[PDB]
Amino acid sequence: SQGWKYFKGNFYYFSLIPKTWYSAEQFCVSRNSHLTSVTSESEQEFLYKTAGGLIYWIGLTKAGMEGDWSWVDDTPFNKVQSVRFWIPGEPNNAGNNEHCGNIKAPSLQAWNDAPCDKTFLFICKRPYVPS
Amino acid sequence: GWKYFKGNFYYFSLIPKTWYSAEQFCVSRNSHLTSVTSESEQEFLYKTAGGLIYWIGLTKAGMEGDWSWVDDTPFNKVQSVRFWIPGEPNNAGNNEHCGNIKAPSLQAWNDAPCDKTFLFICKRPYVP
Amino acid sequence: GWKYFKGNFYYFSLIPKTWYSAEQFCVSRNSHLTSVTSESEQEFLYKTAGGLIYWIGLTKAGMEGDWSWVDDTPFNKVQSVRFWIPGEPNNAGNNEHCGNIKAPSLQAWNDAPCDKTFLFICKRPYV
Amino acid sequence: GWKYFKGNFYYFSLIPKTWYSAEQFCVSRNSHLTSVTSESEQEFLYKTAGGLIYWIGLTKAGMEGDWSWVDDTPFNKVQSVRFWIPGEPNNAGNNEHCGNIKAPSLQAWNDAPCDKTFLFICKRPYVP
Ligand SMILES: O=S(=O)(O)N[C@@H]1[C@@H](O)[C@H](O)[C@@H](COS(=O)(=O)O)O[C@@H]1O
Ligand SMILES: O=S(=O)(O)N[C@@H]1[C@@H](O)[C@H](O)[C@@H](COS(=O)(=O)O)O[C@@H]1O
Ligand SMILES: O=S(=O)(O)N[C@@H]1[C@@H](O)[C@H](O)[C@@H](COS(=O)(=O)O)O[C@@H]1O
Ligand SMILES: O=S(=O)(O)N[C@@H]1[C@@H](O)[C@H](O)[C@@H](COS(=O)(=O)O)O[C@@H]1O
Ligand SMILES: N[C@@H](Cc1c[nH]c2ccccc12)C(=O)O
Ligand SMILES: N[C@@H](Cc1c[nH]c2ccccc12)C(=O)O
Ligand SMILES: N[C@@H](Cc1c[nH]c2ccccc12)C(=O)O
Ligand SMILES: [Ca+2]
Ligand SMILES: [Ca+2]
Ligand SMILES: [Cl-]
Ligand SMILES: [Cl-]
Ligand SMILES: [Cl-]
Ligand SMILES: [Cl-]
Ligand SMILES: [Cl-]
Ligand SMILES: [Cl-]
Ligand SMILES: [Cl-]
Ligand SMILES: [Cl-]
Ligand SMILES: [Cl-]
Ligand SMILES: [Cl-]
Ligand SMILES: [Cl-]
Ligand SMILES: [Cl-]
Ligand SMILES: [Eu+2]
Ligand SMILES: [Eu+2]
Ligand SMILES: [Eu+2]
Ligand SMILES: [Eu+2]
Ligand SMILES: [Eu+2]
Numbered sequence: 131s132q133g134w135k136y137f138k139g140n141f142y143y144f145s146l147i148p149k150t151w152y153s154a155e156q157f158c159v160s161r162n163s164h165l166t167s168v169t170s171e172s173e174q175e176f177l178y179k180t181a182g183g184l185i186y187w188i189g190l191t192k193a194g195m196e197g198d199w200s201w202v203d204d205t206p207f208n209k210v211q212s213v214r215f216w217i218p219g220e221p222n223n224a225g226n227n228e229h230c231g232n233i234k235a236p237s238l239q240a241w242n243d244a245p246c247d248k249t250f251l252f253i254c255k256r257p258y259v260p261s
Numbered sequence: 262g263w264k265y266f267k268g269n270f271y272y273f274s275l276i277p278k279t280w281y282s283a284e285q286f287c288v289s290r291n292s293h294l295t296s297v298t299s300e301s302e303q304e305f306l307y308k309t310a311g312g313l314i315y316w317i318g319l320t321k322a323g324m325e326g327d328w329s330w331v332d333d334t335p336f337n338k339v340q341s342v343r344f345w346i347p348g349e350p351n352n353a354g355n356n357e358h359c360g361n362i363k364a365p366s367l368q369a370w371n372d373a374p375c376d377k378t379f380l381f382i383c384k385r386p387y388v389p
Numbered sequence: 390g391w392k393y394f395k396g397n398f399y400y401f402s403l404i405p406k407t408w409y410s411a412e413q414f415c416v417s418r419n420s421h422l423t424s425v426t427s428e429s430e431q432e433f434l435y436k437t438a439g440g441l442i443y444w445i446g447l448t449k450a451g452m453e454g455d456w457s458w459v460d461d462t463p464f465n466k467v468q469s470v471r472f473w474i475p476g477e478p479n480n481a482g483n484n485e486h487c488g489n490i491k492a493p494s495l496q497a498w499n500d501a502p503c504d505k506t507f508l509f510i511c512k513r514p515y516v
Numbered sequence: 517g518w519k520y521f522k523g524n525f526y527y528f529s530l531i532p533k534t535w536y537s538a539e540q541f542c543v544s545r546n547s548h549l550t551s552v553t554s555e556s557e558q559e560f561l562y563k564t565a566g567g568l569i570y571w572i573g574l575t576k577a578g579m580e581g582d583w584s585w586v587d588d589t590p591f592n593k594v595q596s597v598r599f600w601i602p603g604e605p606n607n608a609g610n611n612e613h614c615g616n617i618k619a620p621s622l623q624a625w626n627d628a629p630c631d632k633t634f635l636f637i638c639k640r641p642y643v644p
Contacts, residue, residue: 139594150376152281156358162324167590169553195291198643204588206551208641210523229285247279247376259582259593268467296463298426327516333461335424339396339515388455388466407631409536413613419579452546486540504534504631 131161136258137176142166143254144180151230154187154252155202163256164203165189171238174215177253178240181233187252190231190241199231203255216241263385266305271295272383273309280359283316283381284331292385293332294318300367303344306382307369310362316381319360319370328360332384345370393515394433399423400511401437408487411444411509412459420513421460422446428495431472434510435497438490444509447488447498456488460512473498520642521560526550527638528564535614538571538636539586548587549573550639555622558599561637562624565617571636574615574625583615587639600625 134141141163149157155165166188168174177188193200199221200207217235221228221243228243232250235242244250263270270292278286284294296318297303306317322329328350329336346364350357350372359375362382373379391398398420406414412422424446425431434445450457456478457464474492478485478500485500489507492499501507518525525547533541539549550572552558561572577584583605584591601619605612605627612627616634619626628634 139592150279150281152279153358153375156321156375159322160324160326192285193288195289197289203590205590206587206641208523209644210642229282246281246285257590257592257594268465332463334463335460335514337396337514386463386465407534407536409534409630410613413576413630416577417579417581449540450543452544454544486537503536503540 134256135180137173140255140257142177142180143256144186145252145254148249148251149187150249151187151191151246151252154250154254155189157252158254158256161254161256163254166253166255167201167203167205168212168215169205169208171214174238174240177233178236178238181236181240181253183236185232185234185242185250187230187232187250188241189255190243191246192229197229214238264309265387267302268387270385270387271306271309272385273315274381274383277378277380278316279378280316280320280375280381283379283383284318286381287383290383290385292383295382295384296330296332296334297341297344298334298337303367303369306362307365307367310365310382312365314361314363314371314379316359316361316379317370318384319372320375321358326358343367391513392437394430396515397512398515399434399437401443402509402511405506405508406444407506408444408448408503408509411507411511412446414509415511415513418511418513420511423510423512424458424460424462425469425472426462426465431495431497434490435493435495438493438497438510440493442499442507443490444507445488445490445498446512447500448503449486454486471495518640519564522557524639524641526561526564528570529636529638532633532635533571534633535571535575535630535636538634539573541636542638542640545638545640547638547640550637551585551587551589552596552599553589553592555598558622558624562617562620562622565620565637567620569616569618569626569634571614571616571634572625573639574627575630576613581613598622 158164189202227245230246233240287293318331356374357372360370360372362369363371415421446459484502487503488498488500490497542548573586601623611629614630615627617624
């Protein structure tokens with residue numbers, strides 16, 4: 131399938147069809163991928179530049195009893211290094227119901243929490259495995 | 262309230278949610294949408310369900326669309342094939358990637374769209 | 390060399406390995422050290438084991454050191470207690486963090502140091 | 517004592533263990549054998565290692581035997597080749613399924629038998 135863009139050892143798929151957060155993750159899984167994690171400034175830059183003006187689900191979701199933010203691809207969540215990537219004022223847990231995360235703003239400060247059952251475009255990430 | 266059966270507690274919800282919002286509720290309660298690994302557990306769940314539909318931990322994974330359990334119990338196709346409603350899973354509309362308990366018998370499971378709202382069942386181990 | 394039982398294939402090794410080297414071998418065969426989640430599976434395993442000791446997928450995990458299955462089957466402590474040898478797990482020397490099938494009985498499991506070498510049993514689903 | 521670097525704490529052990537016994541020690545301390553995801557982290561680790569060999573979270577997984585991280589960080593094979601000692605991994609004796617930090621250089625990693633005993637490095641994120 132076309133639509134996979136390469137960046138630093140991973141391919142990224144910016145969807146054309148919007149889905150709920152979990153239905154997006156399931157699509158990514160059906161393509162041997164996961165909703166993308168973000169672990170560096172250059173990766174965040176790649177994502178929001180490619181996103182343009184559109185909102186995309188990423189692999190941010192609350193997990194555990196405490197509801198700490200986590201990555202669906204099981205990258206350990208680094209709160210210290212992730213603080214710089216939220217939109218100012220986010221996450222705000224509007225309605226006490228915003229348990230998933232999307233990229234929203236055209237900036238390094240781009241993440242927003244939103245209800246998992248809302249439909250948005252989404253970004254899958256899968257590693258390249260050279261022989 | 263939680264119900265106890267063979268080393269696990271089970272939560273039969275009173276309010277419906279999407280499959281994933283249900284799983285997040287279970288996770289917030291240190292649990293998961295329930296797996297099913299024996300006829301006695303299947304029987305306990307459908308008898309307790311009382312003829313109502315409840316999300317369980319069934320969901321597709323992998324490129325193959327293989328079914329899986331969200332609590333990471335290995336899914337056993339041979340052992341589980343008799344737990345589906347006859348004709349299910351039929352992936353109706355090409356969009357039924359989660360599973361629920363529906364019919365009151367051992368042949369109980371149906372696949373349904375993950376974004377549909379149903380009551381749900383969490384499962385939590387008792388740990389002495 | 391794989392033996393079939395109720396939708397799973399099982400490999401009873403002829404070579405002994407440490408618990409983790411055994412698990413690695415199982416992984417290279419698209420499998421894991423076996424979990425045990427029913428009386429009939431326990432019976433099939435101890436009967437086939439024939440009185441020899443085999444590593445199974447039992448291992449301590451998490452901060453509390455509770456017993457777990459390496460294949461990620463949730464561990465049912467209540468229903469598993471009848472599968473340990475009487476008196477086990479006894480954490481001899483404070484260093485027995487993996488488990489094996491030892492006795493030919495439904496009370497079969499013993500905890501032993503993960504770095505000791507035993508025969509091992511892999512399990513993989515019929516797919 | 518845990519050493520801090522870029523949002524994670526690190527424990528450099530004083531007693532050697534096998535790879536898996538090392539991982540179990542880390543797990544008992546709410547941690548894992550360390551992953552390595554940047555040049556700056558690789559530099560922090562080998563410089564702190566001071567020329568001694570430490571197990572890290574490198575281990576083979578899957579039927580293919582691809583390298584993986586035990587803390588479940590997805591393994592970036594493209595970006596990690598810079599971190600192996602030239603000529604490694606060489607799977608000596610076809611029995612080297614775990615990895616350690618060995619050479620004090622950005623090219624530091626060696627695969628070695630999982631049953632050999634080395635010092636080890638645990639890693640855990642700061643969680644408020
Ligand atoms: O500056 S605010 O306007 O307060 N920012 C809010 C978000 O914080 C909130 O999550 C959404 C809900 O909409 S949703 O479609 O994402 O669910 O609406 C605005 O974007
Ligand atoms: O005999 S069939 O017609 O195939 N049975 C179908 C199901 O297989 C299908 O999942 C649902 C969709 O509705 S939903 O309520 O489950 O979403 O409708 C019927 O019950
Ligand atoms: O009733 S006891 O005799 O004390 N039971 C102990 C076990 O609990 C102990 O794990 C082993 C150590 O040997 S090992 O081979 O398992 O390492 O020896 C005995 O069998
Ligand atoms: O250039 S080589 O000779 O191939 N380098 C080898 C390593 O690749 C090999 O892993 C070890 C085994 O020793 S061990 O202590 O790590 O087990 O010995 C040398 O360092
Ligand atoms: N408002 C709570 C809700 C919550 C707790 N645990 C969770 C686990 C998953 C999803 C949501 C939660 C929070 O942000 O933490
Ligand atoms: N329960 C173990 C200690 C422990 C805690 N977590 C662990 C994880 C793995 C191995 C051992 C542990 C003991 O007392 O001896
Ligand atoms: N020669 C293979 C052996 C192997 C495949 N899968 C594994 C999983 C675990 C340990 C070893 C393997 C390799 O090192 O890649
Ligand atoms: Ca159906
Ligand atoms: Ca013992
Ligand atoms: Cl698409
Ligand atoms: Cl009971
Ligand atoms: Cl409820
Ligand atoms: Cl039964
Ligand atoms: Cl019992
Ligand atoms: Cl019992
Ligand atoms: Cl008992
Ligand atoms: Cl130490
Ligand atoms: Cl590289
Ligand atoms: Cl590189
Ligand atoms: Cl390179
Ligand atoms: Cl190399
Ligand atoms: Eu960087
Ligand atoms: Eu928000
Ligand atoms: Eu219906
Ligand atoms: Eu040497
Ligand atoms: Eu080597």
